[PDB]
Amino acid sequence: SSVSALKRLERSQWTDKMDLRFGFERLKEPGEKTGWLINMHPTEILDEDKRLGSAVDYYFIQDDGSRFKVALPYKPYFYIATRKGCEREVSSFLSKKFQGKIAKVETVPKEDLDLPNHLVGLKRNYIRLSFHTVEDLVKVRKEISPAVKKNREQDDQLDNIVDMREYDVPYHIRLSIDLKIHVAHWYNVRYRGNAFPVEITRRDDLVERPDPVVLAFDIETTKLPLKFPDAETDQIMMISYMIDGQGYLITNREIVSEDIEDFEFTPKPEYEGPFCVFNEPDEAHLIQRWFEHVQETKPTIMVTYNGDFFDWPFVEARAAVHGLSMQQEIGFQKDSQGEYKAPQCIHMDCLRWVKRDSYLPVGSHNLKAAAKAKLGYDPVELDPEDMCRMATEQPQTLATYSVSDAVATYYLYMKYVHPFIFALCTIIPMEPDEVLRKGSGTLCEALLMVQAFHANIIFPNKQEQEFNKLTDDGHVLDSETYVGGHVEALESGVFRSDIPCRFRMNPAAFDFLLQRVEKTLRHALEEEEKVPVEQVTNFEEVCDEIKSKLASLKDVPSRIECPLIYHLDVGAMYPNIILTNRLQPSAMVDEATCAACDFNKPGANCQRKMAWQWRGEFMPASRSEYHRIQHQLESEKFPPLFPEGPARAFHELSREEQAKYEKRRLADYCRKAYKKIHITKVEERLTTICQRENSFYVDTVRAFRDRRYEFKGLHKVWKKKLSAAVEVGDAAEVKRCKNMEVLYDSLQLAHKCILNSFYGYVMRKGARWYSMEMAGIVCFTGANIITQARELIEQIGRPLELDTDGIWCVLPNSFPENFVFKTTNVKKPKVTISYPGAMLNIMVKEGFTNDQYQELAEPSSLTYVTRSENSIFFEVDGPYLAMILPASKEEGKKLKKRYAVFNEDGSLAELKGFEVKRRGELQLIKIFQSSVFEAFLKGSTLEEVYGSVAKVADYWLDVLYSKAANMPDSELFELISENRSMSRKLEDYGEQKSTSISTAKRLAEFLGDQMVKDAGLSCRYIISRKPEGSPVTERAIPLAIFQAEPTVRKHFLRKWLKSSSLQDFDIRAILDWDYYIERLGSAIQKIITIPAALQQVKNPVPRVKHPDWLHKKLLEKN
DNA sequence: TCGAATCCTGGATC
DNA sequence: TCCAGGATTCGA
Ligand code: SF4
């Protein structure tokens, strides 16, 4: 171990060497300094006693370019419980047993959560242990844990030690929790000298923030035609990097036909950067010149795009050929988890953020689309085939293409990413790297621990999953879940602000509105506005108008009228529900606990109970039969992980094989023994939610809720101040106000994201605070509110669409919608209020409001308040110009969200369900889809809308029948092809056949075994016809064949069809034309014809026929 | 002959 | 990280 420690000291020395190369010279001198706490790492440090001890390492940057590092020693600890009266004796045992291997032992009382008679104020002991090094702590934990395990199986001296807690918190987190240290604040640090620890203090009077230098790059390489490049055999053609707004380019003049002149490029005036070209006589000197320039630049942050698959692996695999090592020059390296990470600068990557937090629709994640959407311009693309040749004949064009991804990457990172990561990281104590890479699961627990810590609460141990949980009746379960909410389209069609439609409204329904109007408007003012009604100058006038309009509604219960459209949305419903009932993961107490809580006395108001729906899924085997098969397994013998190891009795096996062996044998038992093997069961359970557990969780959510609204307020203020800076045009003020605006914008979004995360954690597998019932109560009662709204709205008018958290609906144009009250209050003389909002925000109030909120008055008194609180509110979006909602071809099928809607300005304001296509898609259908939406804006009434549609939709179906011979021949390939690409290598597929596999086979005879010989394949193909009735999987032929030499093309065409005598050989004859007509027929069916028939319009295309079921229904009804 | 139940493999921006 | 889509098997 001493040699291992010496190796760790060598690692330390090497890291100090690199930090010196990057100017992160350690602090040595007594004094105080101020700086920005950019990054931190763990490292172990030798003390003045020459004992190696664990430490953490903090990196700072000044307001100038100077930089420094400081290190803190701090001994980790973990807790063990005890049986009664053991603590002193057990302490003497441990200190005898582990002398020199534990540093200190201590007795501390703590707030348990599960201790009976909890809230009277009792608490239990724990023992704290302290260690010099994490190695020794690990080794002692490995020794200790089995002795607890044996006791839990029962549930010398070690038999008395019962439990242990917080044994697995990452060490570099621990410090930040204990010392309140957090990143991207300003800090002030003083070093007294080695006789003292460093003293470190947070600032909060400084808000202006420094700017780190930022660099990004991209790399362009050779490849061989029709395969992926080889890390060992391909070579580099050009490399380009953008830094602080200046572009640099380098290129391989041994490959490029001519050297490149320095030039300039800008897609939009925002994106300023020009470029400059270095040039070199050989490839190796490219990489040497790169590493020299980056060493001289010594930049702190380094942004790439998808740094896993390609770039760093490539530059590494072509370092060794010339004896280079970036792991010496820059000091980057791979790590056990697979990614690249480095001692002193942090590798950062937009793609993780795009995946995790963009909310862009699926399949738009491809770089060009994401850039276009966020940055608002179209970057241009060349086919990766053509680019390799183009190098030979027009270099300037290739350089002008390749440069673009530098600019796009740099500005994407700066404008969107860089405000977000640090701002969010101001709240949550991890490193800027982990918070970007981590999922939203672990992150929220990494916050929540802070609160649990300062409340002095001992953490629970991880909720490791059980195996084959037995049911209450003794059935073997396989799974459990809460019954979800659902989404469906209630009806389908097209709707517009200006085309007549029909309604029936129940004539008695409006009565239940008109008899409550005044109260409702009172609530609408007093609940939301909080302006006293005594300020209102015209309260009666508007109510009298509304009454008259509701009377006009009652006068004609069924009507022909133009429709409105609105979207009703319960913004952030789930957090509000959690705030509304005092749900806490600790507080869903069982009933048995109320056998002991001294507060459970007659007149107790504190019990509150709610119901949720649970799903079982279980096999039919009875409890005695599982034991009967166990008594068969008791005889059996199994091979261990290596058959060279001794064969194991069932006693010796690990659980993860036992469980599968018994489960499969019980399954094969049932498969014969019972007629059906899985039972699915729904059951309704009633749970009690303890109203008086410690409040810290809800107080956390409340704090975040209110802070978000404060920051949105300040963001609005600063956006106004920015508008004033734009008017004044003073660059200094523009700089200041824009930097404030972006700061608040980022911090506001960050709080939104974390607040949405607060729901998703509590269901996650293995989470520390886990409880199925937290999903149950909140989800079910949430869906229950939607049913109330649906039941209310369907009497007034048809609901079109029913979201997870909202509704789309029509209302009749005559229905009252929006009003202005007038008042004396100079703060707000007149106020606008929307009538559906008032209706919903009163209807929810009567049922949902909570009568049972409680809160503690004085810890020593145990006097408690009673209170009521509510925070569900509906919100109204609309109107919208037009809406389209397609329907699936099948009889009565259910759906998933698919719709579109349009703004009055003609923008496609929202769409959903029209995915960007997984696995690739034909171009023709793509153009058809985007084209047809253009038609719907035109037309007078129902017939004329389709009169517009048909005179565009016909245009393609004519082209396919005609073959449009006038069209240039290459465009058909552009118009019909598929680019489906595959990842395995041919022999990985085995004895199998598929369009891809058959393509892989047929292609090879063009050029040989090379394309099978190495991994992955990419191709383009079309469907052949003449071998009719063999399925399409066999009929595909690769496009490449057309380009081949005429006699070879003849030979293979005469082979691949089994065609004996063919004389005509061109795509016009050979295409399986009408297969693509079927592709068209199966599109145009679902978007147009079915909708048109569903609302009784003539079949809008003679060429296509209704699916037979629809025809038989339509003929029966007419 | 016709309808329902069960077990299986793939998905990642490429 | 499990949902969705097709093929196989059993009942009437
Ligand atoms: S229901 Fe009442 S008595 Fe029972 S644990 Fe909760 S607060 Fe205590």
Side-chain angles (χ1 to χ4, degrees):
Chain A
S1 59
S2 182
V3 179
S4 181
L6 181 62
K7 304 311 298 188
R8 195 74 205 209
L9 294 177
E10 287 285 24
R11 291 282 284 200
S12 305
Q13 174 276 119
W14 178 92
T15 51
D16 288 1
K17 192 77 71 176
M18 196 62 67
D19 291 351
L20 288 173
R21 200 186 292 160
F22 290 94
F24 281 92
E25 186 165 18
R26 293 181 73 262
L27 182 68
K28 311 167 198 169
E29 309 90 333
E32 60 205 79
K33 309 187 81 164
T34 70
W36 192 68
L37 183 79
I38 195 167
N39 200 14
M40 61 184 172
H41 286 156
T43 198
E44 53 190 304
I45 295 296
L46 192 71
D47 75 5
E48 68 178 327
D49 195 29
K50 300 90 192 167
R51 187 181 296 89
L52 181 56
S54 189
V56 302
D57 197 7
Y58 292 164
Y59 296 73
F60 281 78
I61 186 171
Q62 296 210 156
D63 55 348
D64 289 345
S66 69
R67 311 183 187 162
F68 61 83
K69 295 183 61 171
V70 186
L72 278 291
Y74 189 80
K75 292 177 290 191
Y77 54 77
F78 80 107
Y79 299 113
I80 68 186
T82 69
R83 190 168 288 115
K84 284 291 189 72
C86 296
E87 297 94 321
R88 200 283 299 273
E89 281 54 50
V90 168
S91 302
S92 77
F93 181 86
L94 277 309
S95 56
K96 282 176 178 185
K97 178 59 165 62
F98 298 105
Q99 71 183 359
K101 197 154 57 181
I102 69 182
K104 190 160 67 81
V105 181
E106 174 65 305
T107 296
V108 180
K110 283 287 184 172
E111 305 292 339
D112 196 345
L113 290 174
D114 300 350
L115 182 70
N117 205 4
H118 188 195
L119 277 301
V120 178
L122 306 186
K123 38 170 54 71
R124 75 198 297 179
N125 298 339
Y126 285 130
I127 299 176
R128 173 189 301 290
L129 305 181
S130 184
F131 290 81
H132 297 294
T133 177
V134 68
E135 184 190 323
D136 287 346
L137 176 145
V138 168
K139 283 176 176 176
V140 174
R141 188 262 301 296
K142 289 294 186 73
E143 178 172 354
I144 286 286
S145 179
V148 163
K149 209 297 197 183
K150 187 180 67 177
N151 263 277
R152 297 189 76 142
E153 291 191 14
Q154 288 195 335
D155 184 11
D156 174 46
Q157 295 296 297
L158 301 190
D159 292 359
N160 288 314
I161 81 182
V162 176
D163 191 20
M164 58 188 282
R165 304 293 176 109
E166 293 194 26
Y167 62 71
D168 74 342
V169 179
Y171 174 74
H172 73 292
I173 292 173
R174 172 59 63 180
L175 268 292
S176 70
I177 295 172
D178 282 355
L179 307 184
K180 323 300 287 191
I181 309 302
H182 272 286
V183 312
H185 295 303
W186 282 97
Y187 285 82
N188 171 79
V189 68
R190 176 80 194 200
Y191 180 70
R192 318 304 287 210
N194 188 41
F196 301 77
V198 165
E199 65 196 14
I200 176 68
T201 58
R202 203 197 294 175
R203 300 292 291 265
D204 61 11
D205 54 330
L206 297 175
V207 178
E208 176 72 318
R209 288 145 77 271
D211 188 17
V213 297
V214 186
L215 167 145
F217 66 79
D218 205 348
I219 186 66
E220 317 290 3
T221 71
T222 56
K223 71 171 184 174
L224 192 73
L226 205 82
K227 70 175 198 179
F228 197 80
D230 173 19
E232 295 205 47
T233 310
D234 279 287
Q235 51 189 345
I236 291 166
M237 283 169 62
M238 77 209 304
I239 186 175
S240 61
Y241 60 91
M242 165 59 73
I243 170 169
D244 306 324
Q246 181 57 53
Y248 290 76
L249 176 65
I250 328 184
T251 186
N252 189 335
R253 192 59 178 82
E254 313 185 89
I255 298 176
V256 181
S257 297
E258 179 57 319
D259 197 19
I260 313 304
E261 313 92 330
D262 317 69
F263 75 111
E264 188 175 314
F265 153 70
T266 292
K268 279 169 55 182
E270 180 170 22
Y271 309 120
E272 47 191 17
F275 276 77
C276 182
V277 173
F278 304 137
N279 47 5
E280 291 289 13
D282 75 45
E283 192 206 33
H285 300 175
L286 303 171
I287 318 306
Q288 206 72 352
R289 189 61 159 65
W290 158 269
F291 282 129
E292 184 177 335
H293 183 262
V294 68
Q295 281 174 348
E296 189 283 335
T297 302
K298 53 179 171 285
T300 302
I301 301 296
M302 182 148 62
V303 189
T304 70
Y305 206 111
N306 196 11
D308 300 338
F309 288 177
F310 198 54
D311 307 343
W312 293 111
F314 198 102
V315 77
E316 180 173 11
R318 204 161 178 74
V321 60
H322 305 145
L324 244 177
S325 171
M326 85 303 297
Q327 197 263 2
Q328 272 53 60
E329 300 294 1
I330 53 173
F332 260 44
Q333 196 164 7
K334 199 163 61 179
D335 197 3
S336 60
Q337 308 310 301
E339 73 286 345
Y340 288 75
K341 290 168 176 164
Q344 57 73 209
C345 60
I346 71 186
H347 179 204
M348 183 142 52
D349 165 11
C350 291
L351 190 70
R352 293 288 171 189
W353 172 83
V354 170
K355 293 277 289 191
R356 206 189 70 188
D357 280 285
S358 176
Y359 301 123
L360 275 169
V362 186
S364 299
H365 308 315
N366 299 15
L367 189 163
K368 272 57 173 171
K372 184 267 292 291
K374 300 305 90 177
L375 292 99
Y377 77 90
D378 191 19
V380 303
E381 181 169 19
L382 177 61
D383 192 327
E385 156 49 27
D386 200 12
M387 75 78 64
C388 192
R389 186 188 181 289
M390 188 171 74
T392 60
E393 282 176 6
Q394 52 177 66
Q396 162 66 331
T397 68
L398 195 158
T400 302
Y401 161 67
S402 173
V403 72
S404 64
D405 289 336
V407 172
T409 303
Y410 174 54
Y411 288 110
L412 175 62
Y413 168 81
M414 267 301 305
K415 188 168 189 172
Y416 292 82
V417 174
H418 185 73
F420 183 86
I421 290 293
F422 290 101
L424 174 146
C425 202
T426 61
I427 302 103
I428 305 186
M430 289 190 285
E431 311 98 296
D433 178 10
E434 290 277 22
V435 299
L436 174 59
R437 247 168 283 276
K438 208 65 53 176
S440 197
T442 307
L443 180 69
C444 187
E445 187 171 280
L447 167 61
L448 187 58
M449 285 185 286
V450 173
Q451 304 299 343
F453 176 70
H454 84 82
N456 203 25
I457 305 175
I458 185 61
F459 304 168
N461 299 330
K462 288 194 180 187
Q463 196 68 7
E464 296 282 37
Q465 67 205 338
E466 299 190 49
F467 295 88
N468 54 44
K469 175 58 166 58
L470 295 177
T471 312
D472 298 7
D473 64 11
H475 293 182
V476 173
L477 301 177
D478 78 40
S479 56
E480 296 184 82
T481 186
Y482 62 96
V483 176
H486 75 293
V487 295
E488 63 193 329
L490 293 103
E491 61 187 67
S492 163
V494 308
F495 304 74
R496 243 177 74 154
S497 72
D498 50 355
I499 297 183
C501 200
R502 177 186 58 72
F503 309 102
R504 274 80 201 225
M505 289 85 76
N506 171 354
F510 294 111
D511 201 69
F512 180 60
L513 308 193
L514 83 92
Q515 209 60 20
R516 297 187 297 126
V517 174
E518 294 83 351
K519 172 178 168 181
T520 306
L521 282 303
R522 173 182 291 279
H523 171 272
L525 287 173
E526 298 197 305
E527 189 90 290
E528 292 276 45
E529 218 65 31
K530 308 191 185 300
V531 178
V533 80
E534 293 85 350
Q535 309 306 147
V536 185
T537 60
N538 80 323
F539 188 87
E540 294 297 333
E541 179 184 58
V542 181
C543 294
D544 211 353
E545 178 165 297
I546 287 169
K547 285 173 180 182
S548 78
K549 297 187 71 161
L550 283 166
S552 182
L553 267 301
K554 188 185 282 189
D555 292 336
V556 176
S558 182
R559 204 177 299 228
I560 297 299
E561 190 140 298
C562 299
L564 305 183
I565 291 188
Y566 281 109
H567 168 79
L568 295 172
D569 197 331
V570 191
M573 189 163 70
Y574 299 124
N576 277 295
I577 291 168
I578 292 174
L579 297 176
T580 299
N581 281 286
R582 284 197 57 170
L583 275 303
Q584 293 195 132
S586 67
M588 286 176 292
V589 74
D590 60 40
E591 193 284 334
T593 304
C594 289
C597 172
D598 274 324
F599 292 106
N600 188 18
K601 282 190 291 281
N605 188 40
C606 68
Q607 302 175 34
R608 177 169 181 74
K609 62 186 71 175
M610 297 184 73
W612 61 287
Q613 290 190 351
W614 165 96
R615 182 179 296 185
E617 184 97 315
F618 49 85
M619 292 159 63
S622 190
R623 192 181 186 176
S624 47
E625 313 319 303
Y626 176 57
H627 299 305
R628 203 192 301 259
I629 181 169
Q630 286 178 327
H631 283 76
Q632 191 274 313
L633 292 162
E634 295 302 317
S635 304
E636 196 150 316
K637 66 190 178 183
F638 306 82
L641 184 149
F642 302 117
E644 173 267 1
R648 299 207 295 187
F650 192 86
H651 300 169
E652 307 170 58
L653 313 184
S654 54
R655 193 72 69 258
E656 296 74 14
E657 73 174 330
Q658 287 181 325
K660 188 172 181 172
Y661 296 175
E662 70 190 327
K663 190 170 182 289
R664 72 181 168 192
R665 200 169 289 180
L666 187 62
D668 274 334
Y669 173 95
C670 292
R671 186 176 280 163
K672 302 185 189 79
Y674 287 101
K675 190 168 184 291
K676 162 158 171 53
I677 196 169
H678 308 297
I679 291 172
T680 302
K681 168 70 185 291
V682 173
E683 190 164 282
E684 183 160 297
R685 300 193 195 299
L686 174 61
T687 297
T688 179
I689 302 163
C690 185
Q691 298 298 281
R692 296 175 65 237
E693 292 216 333
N694 187 303
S695 67
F696 78 97
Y697 186 102
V698 290
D699 288 325
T700 303
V701 181
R702 186 172 280 130
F704 274 62
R705 190 197 71 168
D706 293 2
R707 295 176 64 186
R708 181 174 177 238
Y709 294 170
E710 296 190 12
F711 294 114
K712 194 171 67 177
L714 302 185
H715 187 202
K716 292 180 293 181
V717 174
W718 281 102
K719 286 176 292 192
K720 293 297 193 290
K721 294 175 71 175
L722 173 61
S723 77
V726 171
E727 195 282 325
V728 175
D730 176 5
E733 183 66 350
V734 169
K735 189 79 172 186
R736 289 177 71 256
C737 66
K738 288 197 104 290
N739 203 42
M740 298 303 295
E741 189 270 336
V742 70
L743 174 61
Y744 286 122
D745 175 78
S746 173
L747 185 147
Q748 181 282 128
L749 180 62
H751 289 72
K752 197 184 74 174
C753 180
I754 188 65
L755 187 54
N756 280 0
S757 194
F758 268 131
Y759 167 56
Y761 166 83
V762 301
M763 65 180 290
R764 179 177 150 272
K765 169 182 166 184
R768 283 191 191 274
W769 286 279
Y770 164 92
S771 281
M772 275 296 290
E773 292 94 317
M774 200 63 84
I777 303 305
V778 172
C779 180
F780 176 76
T781 311
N784 190 44
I785 278 176
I786 290 296
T787 73
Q788 290 271 25
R790 200 201 76 208
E791 183 162 298
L792 177 59
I793 190 62
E794 199 278 335
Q795 300 285 329
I796 278 57
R798 290 144 62 204
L800 294 317
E801 155 61 349
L802 192 151
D803 216 338
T804 302
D805 54 3
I807 296 181
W808 296 68
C809 75
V810 49
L811 288 93
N813 189 58
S814 306
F815 187 88
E817 67 176 329
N818 202 343
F819 294 96
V820 171
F821 286 117
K822 298 181 67 176
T823 81
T824 59
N825 189 346
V826 172
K827 291 295 191 289
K828 289 192 293 189
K830 62 180 185 291
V831 177
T832 303
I833 189 65
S834 56
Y835 191 69
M839 279 294 168
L840 305 176
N841 289 328
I842 186 61
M843 175 274 279
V844 73
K845 195 178 176 73
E846 308 292 22
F848 298 92
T849 290
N850 184 353
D851 305 336
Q852 303 183 273
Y853 214 101
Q854 290 222 258
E855 196 151 27
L856 78 93
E858 159 45 50
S860 66
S861 74
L862 303 175
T863 59
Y864 276 71
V865 173
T866 302
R867 191 158 66 81
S868 284
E869 187 158 315
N870 170 36
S871 288
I872 310 94
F873 294 108
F874 285 83
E875 201 154 53
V876 178
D877 297 339
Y880 301 121
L881 183 73
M883 180 171 170
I884 300 170
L885 198 150
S888 54
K889 313 198 311 296
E890 297 172 66
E891 178 93 71
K893 211 73 173 195
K894 311 310 300 186
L895 280 167
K896 300 187 73 171
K897 303 216 297 176
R898 277 181 161 82
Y899 43 80
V901 57
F902 298 97
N903 187 279
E904 277 62 31
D905 70 20
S907 309
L908 176 50
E910 181 160 29
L911 72 91
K912 210 64 164 66
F914 302 130
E915 301 195 331
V916 178
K917 286 76 179 160
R918 71 188 74 197
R919 299 169 152 170
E921 189 53 76
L922 289 313
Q923 174 69 358
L924 182 153
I925 186 170
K926 190 194 294 172
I927 303 175
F928 181 70
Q929 289 170 7
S930 65
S931 182
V932 292
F933 292 116
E934 204 283 332
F936 275 94
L937 303 185
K938 306 97 183 178
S940 177
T941 63
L942 278 163
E943 301 301 321
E944 305 316 314
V945 184
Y946 297 112
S948 181
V949 170
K951 292 178 64 174
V952 168
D954 277 329
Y955 177 83
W956 298 96
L957 197 63
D958 178 8
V959 167
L960 300 188
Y961 279 60
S962 182
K963 311 190 198 310
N966 313 71
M967 184 189 294
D969 196 53
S970 61
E971 300 191 23
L972 177 59
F973 305 87
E974 180 179 352
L975 180 60
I976 305 181
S977 288
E978 177 179 305
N979 307 327
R980 190 167 179 160
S981 185
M982 71 183 222
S983 181
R984 273 69 166 75
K985 200 168 73 66
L986 174 62
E987 73 271 46
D988 303 337
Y989 296 86
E991 292 295 346
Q992 182 176 189
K993 62 192 296 181
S994 74
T995 53
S996 306
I997 291 163
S998 186
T999 303
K1001 296 292 191 71
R1002 287 188 188 258
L1003 185 279
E1005 314 315 314
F1006 180 43
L1007 281 175
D1009 302 343
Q1010 288 77 7
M1011 298 77 71
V1012 301
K1013 189 61 174 182
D1014 58 16
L1017 184 65
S1018 305
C1019 57
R1020 305 183 193 176
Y1021 77 94
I1022 63 179
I1023 293 85
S1024 73
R1025 199 267 296 195
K1026 189 169 179 174
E1028 293 181 343
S1030 181
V1032 191
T1033 182
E1034 191 164 284
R1035 307 206 305 271
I1037 63 172
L1039 174 65
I1041 193 64
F1042 285 85
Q1043 292 65 231
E1045 184 288 315
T1047 70
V1048 173
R1049 200 173 76 167
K1050 281 297 210 302
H1051 181 90
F1052 282 113
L1053 292 171
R1054 284 185 162 218
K1055 197 77 61 69
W1056 283 0
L1057 302 172
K1058 195 182 181 180
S1059 183
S1060 54
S1061 65
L1062 186 59
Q1063 305 300 312
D1064 194 6
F1065 303 92
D1066 193 10
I1067 190 161
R1068 314 211 85 79
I1070 273 60
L1071 278 169
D1072 190 10
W1073 279 100
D1074 82 348
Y1075 169 68
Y1076 302 106
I1077 286 163
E1078 200 289 334
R1079 287 290 184 175
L1080 205 174
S1082 52
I1084 192 172
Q1085 265 175 97
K1086 62 164 68 76
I1087 186 157
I1088 283 156
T1089 64
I1090 270 55
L1094 280 170
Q1095 65 188 127
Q1096 295 68 57
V1097 182
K1098 308 299 86 174
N1099 172 30
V1101 47
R1103 205 75 65 196
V1104 187
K1105 293 179 179 179
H1106 292 193
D1108 187 54
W1109 75 262
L1110 175 62
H1111 192 282
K1112 285 162 180 169
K1113 190 183 307 188
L1114 188 287
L1115 176 63
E1116 184 60 29
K1117 64 161 57 181
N1118 289 95

